[PDB]
Scaffold this active site. Structure first.
Site, PDB file in Angstrom:
ATOM      1  N   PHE D   2       0.859  -1.214   0.000  1.00  0.00           N
ATOM      2  CA  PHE D   2       0.000   0.000   0.000  1.00  0.00           C
ATOM      3  C   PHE D   2       0.887   1.253   0.000  1.00  0.00           C
ATOM      4  O   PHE D   2       1.711   1.413   0.919  1.00  0.00           O
ATOM      5  CB  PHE D   2      -0.952   0.000   1.201  1.00  0.00           C
ATOM      6  CG  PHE D   2      -1.632   1.321   1.459  1.00  0.00           C
ATOM      7  CD1 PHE D   2      -2.565   1.826   0.567  1.00  0.00           C
ATOM      8  CD2 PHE D   2      -1.334   2.065   2.592  1.00  0.00           C
ATOM      9  CE1 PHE D   2      -3.187   3.044   0.803  1.00  0.00           C
ATOM     10  CE2 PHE D   2      -1.958   3.282   2.826  1.00  0.00           C
ATOM     11  CZ  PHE D   2      -2.884   3.769   1.933  1.00  0.00           C
TER      12      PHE D   2
ATOM     13  N   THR H   1      -2.065  -2.621   6.876  1.00  0.00           N
ATOM     14  CA  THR H   1      -2.000  -2.603   5.397  1.00  0.00           C
ATOM     15  C   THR H   1      -2.328  -3.988   4.858  1.00  0.00           C
ATOM     16  O   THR H   1      -1.656  -4.935   5.245  1.00  0.00           O
ATOM     17  CB  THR H   1      -0.595  -2.270   4.909  1.00  0.00           C
ATOM     18  OG1 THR H   1      -0.380  -0.883   5.157  1.00  0.00           O
ATOM     19  CG2 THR H   1      -0.421  -2.579   3.441  1.00  0.00           C
ATOM     20  N   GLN H   2      -3.328  -4.077   3.987  1.00  0.00           N
ATOM     21  CA  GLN H   2      -3.701  -5.391   3.425  1.00  0.00           C
ATOM     22  C   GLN H   2      -3.756  -5.289   1.904  1.00  0.00           C
ATOM     23  O   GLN H   2      -3.044  -4.476   1.336  1.00  0.00           O
ATOM     24  CB  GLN H   2      -5.076  -5.808   3.943  1.00  0.00           C
ATOM     25  CG  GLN H   2      -5.752  -4.774   4.827  1.00  0.00           C
ATOM     26  CD  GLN H   2      -6.449  -3.676   4.074  1.00  0.00           C
ATOM     27  OE1 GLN H   2      -5.872  -2.625   3.845  1.00  0.00           O
ATOM     28  NE2 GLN H   2      -7.697  -3.911   3.705  1.00  0.00           N
ATOM     29  N   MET H 107      -1.886   3.908   7.977  1.00  0.00           N
ATOM     30  CA  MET H 107      -1.342   2.875   7.051  1.00  0.00           C
ATOM     31  C   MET H 107      -2.200   1.607   7.114  1.00  0.00           C
ATOM     32  O   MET H 107      -1.638   0.512   6.942  1.00  0.00           O
ATOM     33  CB  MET H 107       0.107   2.530   7.408  1.00  0.00           C
ATOM     34  CG  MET H 107       1.059   3.685   7.205  1.00  0.00           C
ATOM     35  SD  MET H 107       1.169   4.171   5.461  1.00  0.00           S
ATOM     36  CE  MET H 107       2.141   2.815   4.808  1.00  0.00           C
ATOM     37  N   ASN H 108      -3.508   1.759   7.340  1.00  0.00           N
ATOM     38  CA  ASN H 108      -4.486   0.641   7.409  1.00  0.00           C
ATOM     39  C   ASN H 108      -5.780   1.101   6.747  1.00  0.00           C
ATOM     40  O   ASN H 108      -6.804   1.267   7.400  1.00  0.00           O
ATOM     41  CB  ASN H 108      -4.704   0.154   8.842  1.00  0.00           C
ATOM     42  CG  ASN H 108      -5.709  -0.974   8.927  1.00  0.00           C
ATOM     43  OD1 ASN H 108      -6.467  -1.062   9.890  1.00  0.00           O
ATOM     44  ND2 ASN H 108      -5.743  -1.826   7.915  1.00  0.00           N
TER      45      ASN H 108
END
Lengths: 244, 211, 235, 222, 195, 204, 240, 232, 4, 231, 4
Positions: D2, H1-2, H107-108
């Protein structure tokens, strides 16, 4: 709320005394007398067990004299349980110092730390102080043989000869009379026992009512030995000095 | 290019005025000297933000010292406040190469180099050319302890010009400062474009050029 | 016993009202605001003649444009001064300007009522905060341990306050010069002080736009005392 | 993985006059080769005669403008409705940007207004809060196309007096608002031709003592 | 890279430390003193990562000076070395370890004996007649193995150290800009000017 | 890079008739460079002997740690710790650093004061116990020591015979390892006497 | 954690815990400070109720904070150790960050700050201690003598006394200490300090301790015989 | 994060004279597998707002619950919950935009692109976009994923600038949206014939159409194709 | 970012 | 009596004395009036000076462009509660792009005051507030008591001699409610209302404090020669 | 490490 039930253990009286420290000292004054005498060639620790029984196992019993390390011992006067809390702390501090500097802890440094812990319980936390007075008998290579005492206030002082617990007033007068500076361990043993023998509230002073310990350079050459006297050894030194 | 050197007349501090974003010239008019107080200067090299932010912050810490102790902060103390701060952020990627220059009755004229690496060094001359920091001037041939103030100002000015010419990431203008007892003095901004041609004609140097 | 944040049946905080009694026992401090500057004066009140009086610091610089005089448990003021200095400098760091005198006062007064069961009791000291800013000009504020602050043309705090305040009521006008204000502070201090006023047991200070906050030399204050004596003897 | 950052393109331009300032920006918002919006404003009135634009990653730009706008609101509350000077705004924004030093706002910030002497002011920031006061600044994708033009046409760089042969520089002169708006329009017209991320529309915010007023001009939509 | 040598003779300890501070292809300084006086009869030389070196030395200096004031007594070099080792031994398993190698030269007043201790950034400690840290290490070890004797005088110790530095100046490929030499004996710590 | 082979060194322990022997080299190095030939790897807490190979900082740290723990043990128990019990204490202490271990190969040797039974044990760095009847090896030349011990050793050797066997096992293993040697010490342990011998060996 | 407000205001605007702390100081053995032209002397009383004491190891009344600053006190001994430790740490912390030893004023201001904090913090009682802090600032020949008390107020003194019968010895100093001409030499200054204690002490034997601090970290504690010579000379002059 | 698992494709939308239209196909893809053929990706909030969501369906179902919970919370101690103090499109959008940017900054992120279509109190058309980065923009036409590339070009022939919004009827706007959905069905590998369409009009209110199908498809000219060049 |  | 030591203790008649004592601090405070029409809402506050050298304590605090209050009691407590409202008004704007409803602002103040009346160690707020605002449902006036009770009213008054102004408003209810699109006449009615609470002292230029918010009127405070018009 |  909870304020209602708070004794406030860390406040000054109008006279500028610490209530709980003063009352703790009153407690200690009823405890069995402990005596320390420092000679040129060693130190003596003598202490009286409080009204024992015939059915108390004496040879496996310890209430007065405790070992802090190979060079330092303490005589206790007050709550045994409170003393054991502090003793284990002191034993750890000594091993922490040894781990860090690779040298046995100087006597005063160990004494100051224990005394700093007692002080804390009088200035913060709102807990009762430790109802304990110590006589520290120790040797290091700076000051040699040393006697100290600490009390619940966290104050500590050095001594040639000192008493704590019951009849200290009487005991300190007798020590101040018969003590000389050039005195030797064998003489200091005799003085310690003669002092207890006269101050004791008991009818007679016997082996089963005493704990006795010496710190001697009386160890093969340049080193220091701690001797915690066995019941039979206390009985022998009582006959030798001529009290029984 | 930042230069700070010591002499009998005090401290000379000379800096260029170019900021670069890679090979892009962001500005030709940047102040690379911070005026911390009347007797304290800070040069700026590395991250534009890191220098600006923390040397401005240093000025605050130096002011609080004066209020608390009713006395001018020593260059040694001021330098160490910044050196101890950046050391806390060590490895985080702060880019900072600064000379803290000042005068105090205690120390006299003093230059301290402070690094984002945590390095803190005292010295008579510090220089930052390209991405390297030197204990000697860009030229060093013209250097003598007993130099005229206005002769010494020239050496500083000329030294930045030397580096500004050769280095692609140095240029714009030269900013000159003279540190003495009873504070520093600004000696003006000199555009390198105009300075170069004037210096060439008068000195008879930069023959490898042509004009 | 009883809560530290307890209200009395009259709707006042006991501990705040009690701290106001501590301030009454404090040494006198006087402030006078003019269009030419703000004057701050204090009684030093040394407990013994062996005490080096110059070491008695009851007038304190917060920034170049803000001075401060104290009265009461003066030890309590050290952390209040520290916070004020930090607030003044921090605001200059964030906004590249001088902090308004009212904003600085408001910042100090936000500590006042941060006590409970934060600190264990209110402050036992009152502050006269004098300064200048571009917006509201020369200003004098009274900062109490209640967290309340008032602006004053002139104000006295400490032992001789109600006596001094009645004198400032008559003497203050909008056209006072700085020289007049200086003499007026010295005059009222000399009136309410136990010991005879000299340069060693009393201390003057001012804040002007030009020169900022200055604590007067003993030699300078001595001359203003001599000037006062002569002008009072003149009628 | 990401990636928390993106590029929304666009270009901003700040020019400072004698008694005025302009902050201009194209109204195009892009992602990769896609046009997101042809009219999405990037220059904002923030109050107290301050105009702001944070150009780069639109999300970080929107966030910063919000925080500064909020910063102006709380300045009024905490300082008795004092007007926030442009120098003070600039220092405040440096602290906002440096706050996120190790997770930066990927934006080039320009603010315009009047200094406390009533003269036109432009302040320019990097992503991590390094700032400097300037006469001219272009920020964003087409900054490299526009800045050289402004050096030549505003500051009169590499321009000398005819018949001297490089002996005397062209005299520095304050441009009128009408002259400045021409340079802004020609700058963006030129940038639009040669930069794919610039076009659609041009919004100019002009700051005077009288207040903030707004001009809009169409740009090529290819 | 930085030269730090130590030689324990009959009645003293001598520490030679390189004068240059270099970051990459730049010489930051040519007169750097890579030493701190821990106590009146104990000297520590240090080499390693920038900042870490001084920061660690000054931190150790402060702790030993505190002990001295509190007890009105000087810690033995053996005790000081053990403290320093334990501080480095803590740091390796910390978030960011101190990358500092140190030599500790001391004169024990109780035993009337000079003592040299070599400690690396991991907290590896040994007592040696002579020690060194860095590239110079291997060479000086081989040379001192030959020439060193236990009963050497301070003057003999300086000549042998003079020979090491001379030989290192030729053999080493970096300009370390000469050394600063300091002697630790019963009279305390002094700096040899002529070298 | 590999922590357990930076400083180098070896320890070997053997059982005999009413006796145990533990021996170590004296080398401490920075990989190829030899630094000290006085670095003993065998320590004793009362009558229990502990040899430690691996990262030298951890050898020193664990020695200081076990001195600490055995000192407190003695004060509270009012008797010296026995080999079997000390083995359990080493295991405990190593496994409590399971995910950040000491880079060591400890070896316990001693005679149980009450039963008089000779006892040796080895450990992995996370405190798994190897309690062998015959011999225990540890260090950079463990392969070499396993080979020497496995051929040279026979059970119920007399103290003065056992000395020769363990000595020849160490010396010949050390000479085939770059990071081992520079002198060697051998402890011969009987119920109430302990002899310590330094061995002549090639110094390269 | 124990949060209880022990130091609070009373209706008459007094903090009794702080005032009761001053009573602890009053009980403490007398301590005196006298600064000469080029020295400061710290005299201290040792109550002779305690004999069979080991004077080698017994905590001394005058403590070094740094090589150039000393602290004596009156009040609870145990409390004094906590202030001395904090001061000694701050002394080394100042050297580490400012690259300069503390001024006597700075060290006083710090100790006074600590004492104050313990008068408006929850769960803690004030220090039952007043301190005399004496020494010379780095590279300065001007003598410095400061006093602190449980409230946290501090101030500079030409000469000052604290502890039991301090009222009496302060009376003596107020008439015997001339500001225009302070004790010129070390002798004169020590003599005046011993004289001041003899007003209160009892016997001039092991009951008086004297510590002389001179500029540039020159601190020495006088012995029994050295002090006994001052005691002898003072009483021989008095017999007239 | 995925990383996204079960995903939804394009959401497309535009303004017209009196309101806004939005549409999305009823498919949840599991990569190249079209696993779920009954998934509604238009979630109405009151009678004045529709939220169209593309991207991870687990994160969509989370957002669905946040909005359901938002309506409940707005009603609490609010006598005008069904009148003057009802949820506005602009309120619902700003909330989501705040959440999306906060989640990217930790960051998720919520792995989605969201379009909020609705009409405000004063009858003003509302249409705004937000995605996993917290990036926001408004336009007469908005689309996510493939829609951005194929739908927007078609919808911008009808509405090119703000001046054509009043000249565009609902008949014309719906026709454009329905045609765009057919083009996406032709050309998007992860799309479906079945879709939902929502009209929010300032006069007629919210009209929600389910089980719509792409029709009038051209395939016949596929019998006239052989090989890839030379095949006859 | 900008960085003499 | 025995049940007034702290806020955590009920009396045998179910009274919270520490709360009632906090309510007493308000009655000691200087008078302030609130009143509204359909279009505008007005605050009128009598400011109190320490003496003739002193300034007049500010009574009115701005919370947002569309909301603010007047205080009576402990000013520092008014600062804490107004700062909280400022944040809640601010949160509503930033997160939901929504101006906080005056009714909801009341609910939030109530819940904040309540927590300080049920927990040991804390104390009730020692101030009463009159919150005026213009939101999507028009003009609003709220009365806050530090018991936690919040009440929506056409008009009211709090502080010393507040009963005089409250009686007047109760008579004038039908008149002043109808004053739509006339801000000056609504203020006049507010100044005439507070005038019923005066004794000895009258309304001077540095004594009177007025605030107004309405349909096309941001929350603005009038002090000094700006209120001379209404004296 | 040791490891059937």
């Amino acid at each position: 709320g909870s304020r209602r039930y708070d004794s406030r253990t860390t406040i000054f009286s109008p006279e500028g005394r610490l209530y709980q420290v003063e009352y703790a000292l009153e407690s200690i004054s009823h405890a069995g007398t402990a005596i320390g005498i420092m000679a040129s060639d060693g130190i003596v620790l003598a202490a009286e067990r409080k009204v024992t029984s015939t059915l108390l196992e004496q040879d496996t019993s310890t209430e007065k004299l405790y070992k802090l390390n190979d060079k330092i011992a303490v005589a206790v006067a007050g709550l045994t349980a409170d003393a054991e809390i502090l003793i284990n702390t002191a034993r750890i501090h000594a091993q922490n110092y040894l781990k860090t500097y690779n040298e046995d802890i100087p006597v005063e440094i160990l004494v100051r730390r224990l005394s700093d812990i007692k002080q804390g319980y009088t200035q913060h936390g709102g807990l009762r102080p430790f109802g304990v007075s110590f006589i520290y008998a120790g040797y290091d290579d700076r000051y040699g043989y040393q006697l100290y005492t600490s009390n619940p206030s966290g104050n500590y002082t050095g001594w040639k000869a000192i008493s704590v617990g019951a009849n200290t007033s009487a005991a300190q007068t007798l020590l101040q009379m018969d003590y000389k500076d050039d005195m030797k361990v064998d003489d200091a043993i005799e003085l310690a026992l003669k002092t207890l023998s006269k101050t004791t509230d008991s009818s007679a002073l016997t082996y089963d009512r005493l704990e006795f310990a010496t710190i001697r350079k009386g160890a093969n050459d340049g080193e220091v030995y701690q001797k915690i006297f066995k019941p039979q050894e206390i009985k022998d030194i009582l006959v030798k000095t001529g009290i029984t | 290019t930042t230069l700070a050197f010591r002499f009998q007349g005090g401290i000379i501090v000379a800096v260029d005025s170019r900021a670069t974003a890679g090979n892009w010239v962001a500005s030709q008019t940047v102040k690379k000297v911070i005026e911390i107080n009347p007797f304290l200067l800070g040069t700026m090299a590395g991250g534009a933000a890191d220098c600006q932010f923390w040397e401005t912050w240093l000025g605050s810490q130096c002011r609080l010292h004066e209020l608390r102790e009713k006395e001018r902060i020593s260059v040694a103390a001021a330098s160490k406040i910044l050196s101890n701060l950046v050391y806390q952020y060590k490895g985080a990627g702060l880019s900072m190469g600064t000379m803290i220059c000042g005068y105090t009755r205690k120390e006299g004229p003093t230059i301290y180099y402070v690094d984002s690496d945590g390095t803190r060094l005292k010295g008579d001359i510090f220089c930052v050319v390209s991405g390297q920091t030197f204990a000697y001037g860009v030229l060093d041939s013209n250097y003598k302890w007993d130099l005229s103030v206005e002769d010494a100002l020239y050496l500083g000015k000329r030294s930045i010009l030397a580096a500004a010419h050769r280095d692609a990431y140095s240029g714009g203008s030269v900013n000159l400062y003279h540190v003495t007892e009873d504070g520093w003095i600004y000696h003006g901004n000199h555009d390198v474009g105009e300075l170069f041609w004037k210096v060439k004609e008068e000195e008879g140097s930069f023959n490898n050029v042509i004009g | 016993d009883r809560g530290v944040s307890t209200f009395s049946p009259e709707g006042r905080l006991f501990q705040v009202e009690y701290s106001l009694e501590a301030i009454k026992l404090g040494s006198t401090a006087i402030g006078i605001a003019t269009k030419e500057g703000v004057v701050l004066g204090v009684e030093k009140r040394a407990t013994s003649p062996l005490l080096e009086s110059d070491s008695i610091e009851k007038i304190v610089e917060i920034d170049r444009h803000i001075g401060c005089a104290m009265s009461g448990l003066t030890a309590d003021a050290r952390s209040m001064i520290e916070h004020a200095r930090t607030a003044a400098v921090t605001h200059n760091l964030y906004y590249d300007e001088d902090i308004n005198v009212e904003s600085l006062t408001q910042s100090v007064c936000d500590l006042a009522l941060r006590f409970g069961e934060l600190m264990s009791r209110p402050f036992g000291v009152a502050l006269l905060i004098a300064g200048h800013d571009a917006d509201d000009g020369y200003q004098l504020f009274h900062a109490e341990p209640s967290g309340t602050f008032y602006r004053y043309n002139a104000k006295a705090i400490g032992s001789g306050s109600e006596g001094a305040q009645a004198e400032l009521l008559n003497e203050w006008h909008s056209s006072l010069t700085l020289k007049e204000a200086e003499l007026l502070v010295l005059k009222i201090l000399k009136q309410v002080m136990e010991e005879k006023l000299d340069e060693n047991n009393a201390q003057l200070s001012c804040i002007t736009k030009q020169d900022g906050f200055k604590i007067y030399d003993n030699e300078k204050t001595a001359e203003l005392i001599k000037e006062l004596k002569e002008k009072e003897a003149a009628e | 993985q990401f990636n928390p950052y993106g590029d929304n393109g666009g270009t901003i331009l700040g020019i400072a006059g004698e008694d005025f300032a302009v902050l201009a920006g194209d109204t195009r918002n892009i992602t990769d080769y896609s046009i997101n919006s042809r009219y999405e404003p990037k220059v904002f009135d923030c109050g107290d005669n301050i105009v702001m634009s944070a150009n780069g990653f639109a999300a970080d730009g929107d966030a910063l403008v919000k925080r500064f706008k909020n910063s102006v609101k709380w300045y009024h509350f905490d300082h008795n409705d004092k007007k926030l000077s442009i120098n003070s705004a600039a220092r405040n924004i440096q602290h906002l940007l440096y706050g996120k030093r190790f997770f930066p706002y990927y934006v080039h910030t320009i603010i315009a207004g009047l200094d406390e002497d009533g003269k036109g002011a432009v302040y320019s920031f990097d992503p991590v809060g390094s700032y400097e006061r300037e006469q001219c600044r272009a920020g964003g994708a087409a900054a490299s196309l526009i800045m050289p033009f402004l050096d030549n046409q505003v500051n009169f760089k590499n321009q000398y007096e005819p018949g001297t042969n490089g002996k005397v520089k062209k005299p520095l002169k304050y441009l009128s608002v009408e002259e400045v708006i021409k340079l802004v329009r020609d700058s963006f017209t030129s940038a639009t031709e040669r930069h794919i991320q610039v076009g659609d529309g041009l919004e100019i915010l002009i700051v005077t003592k009288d207040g903030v007023r707004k001009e809009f001009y169409e740009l090529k939509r290819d | 890279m930085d030269i730090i040598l130590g030689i324990r003779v009959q009645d003293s300890v001598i520490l030679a430390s390189s004068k240059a501070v270099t970051r990459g292809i730049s010489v930051l300084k040519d007169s750097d003193d890579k030493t701190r006086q821990l106590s009146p009869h104990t000297l520590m030389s240090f080499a390693g990562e920038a900042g870490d070196t001084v920061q660690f030395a000054e931190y150790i200096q402060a702790n030993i000076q505190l002990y001295s004031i509190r007890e009105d007594y000087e810690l033995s070099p053996q005790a000081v070395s053990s403290f320093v080792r334990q501080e480095l031994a803590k740091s390796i398993r910390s978030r960011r370890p101190y990358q500092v190698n140190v030599l500790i030269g001391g004169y024990d007043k109780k035993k009337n004996k000079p003592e040299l201790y070599q400690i690396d950034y991991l907290g590896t400690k040994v007592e040696l007649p002579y020690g060194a840290h860095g590239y110079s290490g291997f060479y000086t070890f081989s040379l001192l193995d030959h020439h060193y004797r236990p009963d050497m005088t301070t003057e003999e110790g300086l000549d042998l150290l003079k020979l090491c530095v001379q030989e290192l100046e030729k053999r080493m490929p970096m300009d370390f800009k000469g050394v600063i030499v300091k002697i630790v004996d019963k009279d305390g710590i002094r700096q040899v000017d002529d070298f | 890079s590999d922590p357990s082979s930076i400083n180098g060194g070896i320890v070997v322990a053997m059982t005999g008739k009413d006796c145990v022997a533990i021996a170590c080299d004296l080398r401490l190095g920075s990989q190829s460079l030899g630094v000290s030939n006085k670095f003993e790897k065998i320590f004793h807490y009362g009558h229990v002997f502990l040899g430690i190979t691996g990262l030298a900082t951890d050898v020193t740290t664990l020695n200081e740690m076990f001195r600490y723990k055995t000192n407190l043990y003695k004060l509270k128990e009012e008797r010296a710790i026995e080999p079997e019990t000390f083995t359990q204490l080493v295991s405990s202490s190593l496994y409590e650093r399971r995910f950040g271990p000491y880079f060591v190969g400890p070896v316990v040797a001693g005679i149980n004061s009450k039963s008089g039974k000779p006892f040796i044990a080895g450990f992995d760095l996370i405190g798994c116990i190897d309690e062998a009847k015959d011999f225990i090896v540890s260090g950079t030349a463990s392969d070499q020591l396993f080979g020497m011990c496995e051929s040279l050793y026979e059970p119920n050797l007399e103290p003065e015979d056992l000395f020769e066997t363990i000595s020849q096992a160490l010396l010949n293993a050390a000479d085939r390892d770059a990071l081992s040697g520079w002198g060697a010490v051998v402890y011969i342990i009987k119920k109430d006497e302990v002899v310590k011998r330094y061995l002549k060996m090639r110094q390269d | 954690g124990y949060d209880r407000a022990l130091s609070i205001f009373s209706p008459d605007g007094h903090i009794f815990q702080v005032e009761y702390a001053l009573e602890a100081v009053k009980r403490g053995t007398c301590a005196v400070g006298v600064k000469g032209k080029n020295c400061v002397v710290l005299g201290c009383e040792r109550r002779s109720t305690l004999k069979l004491q080991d004077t080698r190891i017994t905590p001394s009344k005058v403590s070094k904070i740094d090589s150039h600053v000393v602290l004596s006190f009156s009040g609870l001994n145990a409390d004094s150790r906590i202030l001395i430790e904090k001061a000694r740490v701050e002394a080394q912390s100042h050297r580490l960050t400012l690259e300069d030893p503390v001024t006597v004023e700075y060290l006083t201001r710090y100790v006074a700050g600590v004492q104050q904090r313990y008068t408006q913090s929850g769960g803690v009682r004030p220090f039952g201690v007043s301190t005399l802090i004496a020494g010379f600032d780095p590279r300065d020949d001007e003598p410095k003598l400061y006093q602190t008390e449980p409230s946290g107020i501090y101030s500079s003194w030409s000469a000052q006394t604290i502890g039991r019968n301090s009222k009496t010895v302060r009376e003596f100093l107020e008439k015997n200490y001339d500001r225009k001409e302070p004790p010129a030499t070390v002798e004169e200054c020590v003599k005046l300090t011993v004289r001041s204690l003899l007003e209160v002490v009892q016997t001039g034997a092991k009951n008086i301790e004297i510590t002389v601090v001179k500029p540039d970290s020159d601190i020495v504690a006088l012995s029994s015989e050295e002090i006994n010579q001052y005691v002898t000379q003072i009483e021989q002059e008095k017999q007239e | 994060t995925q990383q996204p698992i079960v995903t939804g494709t394009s959401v497309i939308s535009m303004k017209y004279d009196n309101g806004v239209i939005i549409a999305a196909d009823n498919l949840g893809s599991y990569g190249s597998l079209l696993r779920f053929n009954g998934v509604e990706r238009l979630i109405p909030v009151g009678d004045n707002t529709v939220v169209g969501i593309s991207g991870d369906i687990s994160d969509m179902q989370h957002i669905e619950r946040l909005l359901k919970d938002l309506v409940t919370e707005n009603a609490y101690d609010n006598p005008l919950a069904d009148a003057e103090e009802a949820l506005e499109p602009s309120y619902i959008f700003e909330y989501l935009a705040t959440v999306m940017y906060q989640r990217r900054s930790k960051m998720n992120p919520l792995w989605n692109a969201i379009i909020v279509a609705g009409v405000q109190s004063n009858g003003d058309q509302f249409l705004r976009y937000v995605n996993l980065l917290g990036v926001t923009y408004s336009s007469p036409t908005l689309a996510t994923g493939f829609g951005a590339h194929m739908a927007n070009p078609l919808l911008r022939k009808v509405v090119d600038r703000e001046s054509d919004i009043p000249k565009t009827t609902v008949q014309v706007a719906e026709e454009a949206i329905v045609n765009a959905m057919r083009v996406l069905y032709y050309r998007d590998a992860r799309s479906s014939r079945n879709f939902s369409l929502a009209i929010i009009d300032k006069n007629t209110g919210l009209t929600f159409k389910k089980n719509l199908q792409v029709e009038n498809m051209k395939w016949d000219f596929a019998k006239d194709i052989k090989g890839y060049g030379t095949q006859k | 970012x900008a960085y003499x | 009596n025995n049940y007034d030591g702290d806020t955590v203790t009920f009396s045998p008649t179910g009274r919270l004395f520490q709360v009632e004592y906090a309510l007493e601090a308000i009655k000691q405070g200087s008078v302030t009036v609130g009143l509204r029409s359909n279009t505008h809402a007005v605050l009128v506050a009598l400011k109190r000076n320490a003496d003739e050298l002193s300034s007049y304590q500010k009574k009115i605090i701005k919370c947002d462009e569309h909301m603010g209050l007047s205080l009576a009691g402990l000013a520092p407590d008014a600062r804490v509660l107004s700062n909280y409202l400022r944040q809640q008004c601010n949160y509503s704007s930033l997160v939901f792009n929504r101006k906080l409803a005056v009714e909801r602002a009341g609910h939030l103040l109530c819940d904040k005051a309540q927590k300080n009346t049920q927990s040991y160690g804390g104390r009730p707020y020692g101030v009463g507030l009159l919150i005026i605002g213009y939101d999507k449902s028009g003009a609003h006036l709220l009365e806050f008591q530090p018991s936690g009770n919040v009440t929506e009213l056409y008009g009211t008054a709090i502080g010393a001699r507040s009963q005089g102004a409250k009686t007047y408003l109760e008579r004038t209810l039908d008149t002043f409610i109808k004053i739509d699109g006339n801000p000056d006449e609504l203020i006049k009615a507010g100044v005439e209302a507070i005038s019923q609470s005066l004794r000895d002292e009258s309304l001077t230029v540095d004594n009177l404090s007025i605030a107004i918010v309405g349909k096309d009127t941001p929350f603005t405070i009038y002090d000094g020669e700006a209120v001379a018009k209404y004296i």
